[PDB]
Amino acid sequence: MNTLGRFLRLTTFGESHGDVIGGVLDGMPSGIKIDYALLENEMKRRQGGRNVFITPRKEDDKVEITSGVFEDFSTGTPIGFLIHNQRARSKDYDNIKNLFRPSHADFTYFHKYGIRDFRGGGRSSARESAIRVAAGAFAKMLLREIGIVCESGIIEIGGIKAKNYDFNHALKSEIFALDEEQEEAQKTAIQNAIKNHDSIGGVALIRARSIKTNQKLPIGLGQGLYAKLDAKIAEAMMGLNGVKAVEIGKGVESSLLKGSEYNDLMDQKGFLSNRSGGVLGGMSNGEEIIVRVHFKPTPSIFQPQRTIDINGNECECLLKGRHDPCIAIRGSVVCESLLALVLADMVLLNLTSKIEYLKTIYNEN
Amino acid sequence: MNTLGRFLRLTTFGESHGDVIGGVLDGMPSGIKIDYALLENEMKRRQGGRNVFITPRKEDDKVEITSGVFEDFSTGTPIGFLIHNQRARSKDYDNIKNLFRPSHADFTYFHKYGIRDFRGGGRSSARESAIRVAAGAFAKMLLREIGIVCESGIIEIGGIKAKNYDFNHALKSEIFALDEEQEEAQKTAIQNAIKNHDSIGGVALIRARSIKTNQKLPIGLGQGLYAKLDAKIAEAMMGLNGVKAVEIGKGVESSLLKGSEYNDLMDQKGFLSNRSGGVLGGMSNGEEIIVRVHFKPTPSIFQPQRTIDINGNECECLLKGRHDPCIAIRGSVVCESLLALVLADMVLLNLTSKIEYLKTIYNEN
Amino acid sequence: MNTLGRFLRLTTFGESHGDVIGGVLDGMPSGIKIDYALLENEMKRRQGGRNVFITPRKEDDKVEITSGVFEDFSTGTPIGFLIHNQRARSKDYDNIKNLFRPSHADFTYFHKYGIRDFRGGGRSSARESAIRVAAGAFAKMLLREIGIVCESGIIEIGGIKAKNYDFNHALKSEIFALDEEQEEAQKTAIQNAIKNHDSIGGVALIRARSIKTNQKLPIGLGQGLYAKLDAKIAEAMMGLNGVKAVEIGKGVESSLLKGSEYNDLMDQKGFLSNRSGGVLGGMSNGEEIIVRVHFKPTPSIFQPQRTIDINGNECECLLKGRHDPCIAIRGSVVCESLLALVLADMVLLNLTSKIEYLKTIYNEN
Amino acid sequence: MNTLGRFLRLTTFGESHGDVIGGVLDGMPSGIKIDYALLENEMKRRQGGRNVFITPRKEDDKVEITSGVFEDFSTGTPIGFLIHNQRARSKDYDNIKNLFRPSHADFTYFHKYGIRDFRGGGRSSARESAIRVAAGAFAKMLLREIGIVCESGIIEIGGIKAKNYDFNHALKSEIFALDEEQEEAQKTAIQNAIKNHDSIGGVALIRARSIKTNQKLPIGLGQGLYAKLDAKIAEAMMGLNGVKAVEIGKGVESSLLKGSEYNDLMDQKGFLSNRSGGVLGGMSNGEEIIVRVHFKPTPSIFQPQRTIDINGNECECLLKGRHDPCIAIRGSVVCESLLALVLADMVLLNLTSKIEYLKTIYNEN
Ligand SMILES: Cc1cc2nc3c(=O)[nH]c(=O)nc-3n(C[C@H](O)[C@H](O)[C@H](O)COP(=O)(O)O)c2cc1C
Ligand SMILES: Cc1cc2nc3c(=O)[nH]c(=O)nc-3n(C[C@H](O)[C@H](O)[C@H](O)COP(=O)(O)O)c2cc1C
Ligand SMILES: Cc1cc2nc3c(=O)[nH]c(=O)nc-3n(C[C@H](O)[C@H](O)[C@H](O)COP(=O)(O)O)c2cc1C
Ligand SMILES: Cc1cc2nc3c(=O)[nH]c(=O)nc-3n(C[C@H](O)[C@H](O)[C@H](O)COP(=O)(O)O)c2cc1C
C-alpha cells in the first residue's frame, strides 16, 4: 500500500535507487496559496540542519511541482512533485552486499518478494522521508488556513531527557533539542556514538495547537470507531522506520495512575490537564495534541556483526563509512510532517459531520 | 469509518443502545470450518474481568450467524452476525443523562455531531468489543489453517509488573495474570481500587506465534510503506478506548539502547534475539510478534467525579453501582482479537506478493 | 466487496437464505430527520406494486433501524437496519438443486468459492435489492435537504418504447410505464411472456433533478479522474443483477452524431440542450442527470433448458412455477435507489473541493 | 480520486500543463519480466495506426521507469514512471482562452474548483491516456503470466458498422478497423468529417480471452456484490473522456430479447453461446469477455459555437486548426489498457477466495 490518508491522499513512487523520487498529494482544496518558502525550509530541516551549510542549490534535493498548482495557488487537482538527487560516485560502505544487515529490512524484503535487489543510497528510508516532508508542507499550508500548527523537537537522546521545552530553541538547534540545559549532554552522547562507531536511540515530541493563544483546536476531529484520531496518528508514526513505540499524552505513564489521580475534567471550553494528549474517546477534545515517538538506535554501525547471506551461510557484516548516529533527530521532523498530514485529512473528513455544513455550502451558494 | 481491514473487512453497526448489535466479516476464504466452541469460548473470555472470578456466569450474549456459513463451513461470502444481550430492568448504577461524564467522549461527540444522545449500557465500547471478539474468532479460525495462534495476558496492574510470562496460567487467572508470583499483589491492587471506588491502569501483552513448536511465522507479512504490519497493529490497538500507548518488541525501551545492543543478530536458522518484536522494516521477520498495550485507569468510578454537562453548566456525577476497576483486563482479550484480525488481513494480502503465487493458483490447478 | 460508496458507505450482510437480512449505512450527516413514511413507501414500491394491494404492514418486509437514529434524527453514526422476509409457509418453484440454471450465477459461484449451497427463495437479488432500496431512502432524505430528487420509470419492454415521459403516471402504473400511449402494448408483451412461460427484457430511465422548478443541480459533483460521477453511476447500475448496458444522456446514440449535432451549447442561464445527460468531464453540469439501464430478460423461465450438473453431465433444467416475467420493472426502482446513493456520496465528497468551504465551516461556524 | 483499482492500484499525477506527466502502479507481484518491447509498442498504438510514421525514440512517448524494477524484473514494490514531451517551436491554434468550450470539461472544473486552467496541449486527454496505456502494459505482462490477453478494435465509425471482426487486421489498420470490408467506408466518414471541420462518434469493441490450452478464462473473477467484474469494467470505461455508454455481451440488444432467446445454455463441452459477454452473476464465466464502448464525437471542432466565458458573458468559441476527427479510434486502445488493469486487479483479489489457496502457498512452502 503506497498511499497514506483517506480524503487528503499521499501516494509515493516507493523505494528506489534512481536519481529521482516522486509523490503526489491528492485531495488539497483549491485556492490555497503555495508557500514556497515553507516547502524549501521543511526540506532543509529534514537534513538535520546543523551549524555550517552551503546553498542547497548545488548541494542537495530540490522539489519540483509538476501539477496541482496554477499561479501559486492549489487548483484542487492532484499535486505531483519530484525530487532529484545523487551526485559524485561513492566508495562502497559495504563489502559483498548479499547479506542481511542486522535491524535492516533486507531480510523481510528478500523473503516477501524473493528478488535480490538492495543497493546503497541510505537504503529503504531517507528517500521516503523527503516525500513525506514535502507532502507535509502542503498539509501545513492547509492547516494554517484554519489556524492550526504542528511542531516537534527532541526530548531525549540516549536516555538524556529534557525537563523544559522550547520549540523555538529546537528550531535552531543542531539536534532539535527542546531543552537547552540538556542539549550539551545530549550532543556529547552523540559524539561518543560516532567515536565508538555506534548509534543511540531517541524520543521525539510532536505537538499540534491553535495559532491563537489559548485558542482550542477543532473539537471532534476523528472518524467513527475505526478511523479514530489517536489510532491514525499511531498508524502513521509506528509506520516510520525505526519507530518501536508511540504514546499519546500521558502515554505509558497512564498505566501507572489511578482514576482519582488521572481522570480529566472540564468546564465550558477545553480541558485543563492535558493527560489525554488532546484526544478523548478517539476524537480531538480541543486541547493540544501531544505525541511521543520512540526510535530504536540507527541500524547501520561500523562494527562487525554476525549474520547470514542470501544463501544462508554465516558471515560477517562490517559496514564501513560514516552513519547516522541517531535517526530520531531527522525522524522528529518526519513525524511532524505526518501529524500534519493526518490532521489535515481529519479536518477534511470532518466537513461531512453535520447536515448544517452541507446546507451552508450548497443552499447558501 | 465503521470498517476495519483491507481484504478481511470487519464492519460494525456502530454504537447502539438497543437489544441487538450487528457486524459483518467480509473476506473469509471459503472452506474454513466454523469452530463454534472457539467462538463461544472467546465470548466467554470477553466477560472475564468483572464479577466473574473462578465460576464466571454465562447467561449472556448469544451470537447468531445470519450468513456466510453453510454446513458449518464458510461459503466465501460475507459472514453477518447479530449479538443478542442485555436483561433485567435498569435501576441505578448511573446518574443524570444530560451530562458528559468526566473524561468521556460524550463531550467530543456533541461538538462533532451536536445531538443530545447517549444513555447507559457502559456508554458503548463494551458493545463494540463484543463485535471485535466475535469477528476475532473467525480470524483465528483462518490463522489456524496455516498454523498461527494469538495469545494475551496481563503483564502489569497498578505498576506491579510481571517478571515471567505464562500464557497458559493467564488463561485460568481471574485477572489473566501472566506471572503467578505477582498475581496476588496485582489482585490486591484491584481489590483496593474496588474498595475505594477507584480504578487503576494496566498493561496487556499480546503475541502471535507459529502453532508448530519450534516453527517460525510467515516472513513478509505487512504491505508496502503505508500498510506496514506494526503500523496496522498500532492503529487497531490505539483505537481501543482507554489505550494511550502501544509498544512493539523492545518498545519504549528501544530508545535507551545502543545499536550494538539493540541489533538482532542471526545464526544458522533464525535471529539470536527479538528486540524487533517479530516486525522488521514493517514486515514480519518470522519471530514472535510482541505487542504491549497501555490502558489508563477507567474514567467512570463509583467515586464522585466532575467535568461538564451538555450546556457547559453544572451537574452531579455520583454514579451509583460499581464500575470497572481495570479495563486492561478485558481489554487484553479484545487486543488479542484485534491482532488476529490484523494478522489474518495481512495473511490474505501477502498472497499477491510473488508471481509464482499466482501461477501456482491459476496454472498449477 | 460488500461495501458500496466512498464516504456514504453501505455495507451488506451479503447473500443468505435466512429470515433476516441486514445492512448498515455510514456517513450520514447528523441532524437529518428520518422520514419513516418515505422509507415505508420505498419498500412498497420495490415490490413492483401492481394492480390492487393491501396495507404493507403485516404484508411483507419491515425495516428495523437498530442504530444511528435518536428521536427521529440521524446521529451521525452508522445506521444499521434489519429486514425480515418470508415466514408463513411457502410453495415450490424449483427442480434439481444440483444443476447450473442458465443465465444464473450458479456456475460462477460454484467455481469461485466451490461450496455448493444453492436453494430457492429468490436465491439472491430480492434480498439485496431490499437493502439497497432501504439505504436509498436515507440517501434520498439527505438529497432532499439540498433540494435534489431522484425518479425513475420504464421506457421499454420487449422493444416497445416510450415516446413521452410522465414520471407521475409511472408511479401509479402496474409496470411503472412512463408513456401511457405505449403502456398497453408494453403490458401485452408482459402478458404474452407469462402465457408462454417466458420472460422479456426491458429498459429503465432514471433521472435526478432539482425539486425547485428549473433550478440547477449542484455543479461539480464527481471526484477526480477515477471517481467520476458517470463512472460511479455506471458501476452501481451495471452491478445490478440483470443489467447488460448503461447509458448517460444521449448514450449509444451519441456515437451516431457529428460534433456539431452533439455539442451542448451554452448561454448565461446554462446549457441549451442536454445530450451530455447532466455529466460533463465526469462531473455534474447542473442539468438533469439522465441514465438508461438495460435489463436482460428474467433468467428463470418455466421451460426445459439444456445445461449441466455439478458433475459435468448434461441434464434438463425445468424451473416449475411462476417467475418474474420482466425484472426491469422492479429493477427500475433499485436503479433509482442506487442513483440516490451515488449522488449523496458525491454531495459529501464535494465538500472538500474549495478552501472557502473549510473556512466557512471552521473559521465561522 | 486519482487512484484506479483495489489492489493493483494506479495513481496518477493528475492533469498538468508541464512537459512531464507521471504515475505509479502499485501491487504488481514480484518476478514479472518487464517487456520493454510491449511497453514501447503500446505507447505507439495509443497515437493511432497511420500507415506512414516516424521511428520511435523521438517526437513523443518514451516511458522512464523510476522504481519497482530491478534487472528487468518487477520487484514487488511500486512501479513509478514518468513520461516526457514538448520541445521548442510549434504551430498555433489559440484565441481567447478564457471561455467554456462546448462538450469539454472546462465548465465543470471551473465550477467545482473555481480556478481557470484549461490551457492548450489538447487540454489533457492524451496526457492521462498515456499514463493508462503505460500502466496497462504492465497489467498485460501480469495477465500473460496466466494466459490472459486483452484485444480491441473499432466496430463503428460515424454509423458505419462492421459485420465481421478480425482483431489481427485491426492491429495493422490505420483506424483499427475490425472489418476490412467496411474500413474504406469508415475512413470516408472520417474524411468527410475533416473536410467539414466536424467530428464523428464511434464504437470500440474490447475483448479478453485465454491463450491457455483449455481456451477458457479463469472462472470467478469479480468480487462480492459491490466489486463485480462487469461493474468495474463499466466504471473504468465510462470514466474515460468521451464515453457515453458501455455494454457487456449482448448489451443493449439484451433488452429486446425473450428469456428463451437470451439464456446461454450449456452441454458437456461448456456454454453453447455467450450473450452474457463472459460475465455471469458479476463474475467471469470462462467465456470471452465482450465489451462495447460508445464514444461521442470529438468535442473540439473548427466551427463557430455559442457559449459563455468564465464570467457569464456570452461569446463565440471558434477552435482553429485541425482536431482529432474521431476520438473513438485512440480511445479503443485506452479501453483495452483499462480492461487489462481491471482484469489484473481482479486476478489478484480472487487469490483469497478459497482456503485451499492459502494452504498451498503457506503450508506447501
Ligand atoms: C464501566 C466501564 C467499562 C468499560 N469497558 C471497556 C472495555 O471493555 N475495553 C476498553 O478498552 N475500554 C473500556 N471502557 C472505556 C470507555 O470505552 C471509554 O474509553 C471511557 O469511558 C472514556 O475515557 P477515554 O475516552 O479517555 O478512554 C470502559 C469504561 C467504563 C467506565
Ligand atoms: C544510515 C541510516 C539512515 C537512516 N535514515 C532514516 C531516516 O532518515 N528516518 C527514519 O525514520 N529512519 C531512518 N533509518 C532507519 C531504517 O530505515 C530502519 O531502522 C530499518 O530499515 C528497519 O527498521 P525496523 O525493522 O524497526 O522497521 C536509517 C537507518 C540507517 C542505518
Ligand atoms: C425469478 C427472478 C427474479 C429476479 N429478481 C430480480 C430483481 O428483483 N432485481 C434484479 O436486478 N435482478 C433480478 N433477477 C436477476 C438475477 O439476480 C440475475 O440475472 C442472476 O443471478 C445473474 O445474472 P446477471 O449476470 O445478469 O447478474 C431475478 C432473476 C430471476 C430469475
Ligand atoms: C482534440 C481532442 C482530442 C482528444 N483526445 C482524446 C483521446 O486521445 N482519448 C480519449 O479517450 N478522449 C479524447 N478526447 C475526449 C475529451 O477528453 C472529452 O470528450 C471532453 O473534453 C470532456 O467531456 P466528457 O469527459 O464528458 O466526454 C479528446 C477530445 C478532443 C477535443
PDB file of C-alpha atoms in Angstrom, chain D residues 80-162:
ATOM      1  CA  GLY D  80       6.750   4.661 -10.711  1.00  0.00           C
ATOM      2  CA  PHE D  81       7.121   6.031 -14.210  1.00  0.00           C
ATOM      3  CA  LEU D  82       7.463   9.381 -15.929  1.00  0.00           C
ATOM      4  CA  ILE D  83       6.567  10.453 -19.453  1.00  0.00           C
ATOM      5  CA  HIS D  84       8.155  13.482 -21.114  1.00  0.00           C
ATOM      6  CA  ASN D  85       7.073  15.603 -24.092  1.00  0.00           C
ATOM      7  CA  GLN D  86       7.051  19.046 -25.732  1.00  0.00           C
ATOM      8  CA  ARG D  87      10.135  20.891 -27.002  1.00  0.00           C
ATOM      9  CA  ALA D  88      10.611  24.199 -28.832  1.00  0.00           C
ATOM     10  CA  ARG D  89       8.526  25.929 -31.534  1.00  0.00           C
ATOM     11  CA  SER D  90       5.040  24.734 -32.539  1.00  0.00           C
ATOM     12  CA  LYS D  91       2.090  25.560 -34.817  1.00  0.00           C
ATOM     13  CA  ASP D  92      -0.567  27.850 -33.307  1.00  0.00           C
ATOM     14  CA  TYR D  93      -4.269  27.265 -32.539  1.00  0.00           C
ATOM     15  CA  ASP D  94      -5.109  29.734 -29.748  1.00  0.00           C
ATOM     16  CA  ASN D  95      -7.509  32.672 -29.350  1.00  0.00           C
ATOM     17  CA  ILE D  96      -9.311  33.979 -26.257  1.00  0.00           C
ATOM     18  CA  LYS D  97      -8.621  31.037 -23.948  1.00  0.00           C
ATOM     19  CA  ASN D  98     -10.954  32.168 -21.151  1.00  0.00           C
ATOM     20  CA  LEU D  99     -14.257  30.613 -22.231  1.00  0.00           C
ATOM     21  CA  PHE D 100     -16.022  27.279 -21.835  1.00  0.00           C
ATOM     22  CA  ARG D 101     -15.562  25.096 -24.920  1.00  0.00           C
ATOM     23  CA  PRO D 102     -18.804  23.167 -25.525  1.00  0.00           C
ATOM     24  CA  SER D 103     -18.686  19.466 -24.631  1.00  0.00           C
ATOM     25  CA  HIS D 104     -15.402  19.950 -22.760  1.00  0.00           C
ATOM     26  CA  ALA D 105     -14.808  19.712 -19.006  1.00  0.00           C
ATOM     27  CA  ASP D 106     -13.931  23.445 -18.779  1.00  0.00           C
ATOM     28  CA  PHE D 107     -17.304  24.402 -17.284  1.00  0.00           C
ATOM     29  CA  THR D 108     -17.432  21.745 -14.557  1.00  0.00           C
ATOM     30  CA  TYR D 109     -13.794  22.102 -13.466  1.00  0.00           C
ATOM     31  CA  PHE D 110     -14.380  25.855 -13.142  1.00  0.00           C
ATOM     32  CA  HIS D 111     -17.463  25.407 -11.002  1.00  0.00           C
ATOM     33  CA  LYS D 112     -16.053  22.606  -8.872  1.00  0.00           C
ATOM     34  CA  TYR D 113     -12.685  24.196  -8.114  1.00  0.00           C
ATOM     35  CA  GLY D 114     -13.171  27.811  -9.196  1.00  0.00           C
ATOM     36  CA  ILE D 115      -9.767  28.028 -10.859  1.00  0.00           C
ATOM     37  CA  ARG D 116      -9.295  28.654 -14.569  1.00  0.00           C
ATOM     38  CA  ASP D 117      -6.561  26.464 -16.030  1.00  0.00           C
ATOM     39  CA  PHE D 118      -7.891  24.965 -19.268  1.00  0.00           C
ATOM     40  CA  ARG D 119      -4.894  25.810 -21.448  1.00  0.00           C
ATOM     41  CA  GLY D 120      -3.556  24.068 -24.541  1.00  0.00           C
ATOM     42  CA  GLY D 121      -1.945  20.727 -25.290  1.00  0.00           C
ATOM     43  CA  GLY D 122      -5.374  19.324 -26.038  1.00  0.00           C
ATOM     44  CA  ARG D 123      -6.383  20.325 -22.502  1.00  0.00           C
ATOM     45  CA  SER D 124      -5.074  16.935 -21.340  1.00  0.00           C
ATOM     46  CA  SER D 125      -6.894  13.835 -22.600  1.00  0.00           C
ATOM     47  CA  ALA D 126      -3.896  12.267 -24.333  1.00  0.00           C
ATOM     48  CA  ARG D 127      -1.966  13.051 -21.146  1.00  0.00           C
ATOM     49  CA  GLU D 128      -3.934  10.758 -18.842  1.00  0.00           C
ATOM     50  CA  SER D 129      -4.344   8.198 -21.605  1.00  0.00           C
ATOM     51  CA  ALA D 130      -0.567   7.898 -21.838  1.00  0.00           C
ATOM     52  CA  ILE D 131      -0.460   7.069 -18.133  1.00  0.00           C
ATOM     53  CA  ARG D 132      -3.242   4.488 -18.523  1.00  0.00           C
ATOM     54  CA  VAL D 133      -1.726   2.828 -21.594  1.00  0.00           C
ATOM     55  CA  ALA D 134       1.690   2.664 -19.919  1.00  0.00           C
ATOM     56  CA  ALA D 135       0.194   1.137 -16.760  1.00  0.00           C
ATOM     57  CA  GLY D 136      -1.890  -1.163 -18.941  1.00  0.00           C
ATOM     58  CA  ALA D 137       1.306  -2.560 -20.454  1.00  0.00           C
ATOM     59  CA  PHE D 138       2.420  -3.778 -17.023  1.00  0.00           C
ATOM     60  CA  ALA D 139      -1.041  -5.199 -16.356  1.00  0.00           C
ATOM     61  CA  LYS D 140      -0.801  -7.090 -19.651  1.00  0.00           C
ATOM     62  CA  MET D 141       2.564  -8.505 -18.517  1.00  0.00           C
ATOM     63  CA  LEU D 142       0.934  -9.845 -15.354  1.00  0.00           C
ATOM     64  CA  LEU D 143      -2.056 -11.283 -17.255  1.00  0.00           C
ATOM     65  CA  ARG D 144       0.177 -13.024 -19.807  1.00  0.00           C
ATOM     66  CA  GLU D 145       1.716 -14.970 -16.910  1.00  0.00           C
ATOM     67  CA  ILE D 146      -1.572 -16.839 -16.522  1.00  0.00           C
ATOM     68  CA  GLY D 147      -2.612 -16.921 -20.174  1.00  0.00           C
ATOM     69  CA  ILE D 148      -4.882 -13.895 -20.438  1.00  0.00           C
ATOM     70  CA  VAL D 149      -4.808 -11.437 -23.328  1.00  0.00           C
ATOM     71  CA  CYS D 150      -6.776  -8.243 -23.989  1.00  0.00           C
ATOM     72  CA  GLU D 151      -7.541  -7.027 -27.508  1.00  0.00           C
ATOM     73  CA  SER D 152      -9.584  -4.273 -29.131  1.00  0.00           C
ATOM     74  CA  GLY D 153     -10.757  -2.685 -32.358  1.00  0.00           C
ATOM     75  CA  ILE D 154     -13.244  -0.279 -33.924  1.00  0.00           C
ATOM     76  CA  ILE D 155     -16.617  -1.738 -34.943  1.00  0.00           C
ATOM     77  CA  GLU D 156     -18.342   1.531 -35.851  1.00  0.00           C
ATOM     78  CA  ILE D 157     -17.324   4.966 -37.106  1.00  0.00           C
ATOM     79  CA  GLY D 158     -19.927   7.612 -37.873  1.00  0.00           C
ATOM     80  CA  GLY D 159     -22.644   4.974 -38.001  1.00  0.00           C
ATOM     81  CA  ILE D 160     -20.747   2.686 -40.389  1.00  0.00           C
ATOM     82  CA  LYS D 161     -20.892  -0.746 -38.745  1.00  0.00           C
ATOM     83  CA  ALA D 162     -18.516  -3.692 -39.033  1.00  0.00           C
TER      84      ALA D 162
END
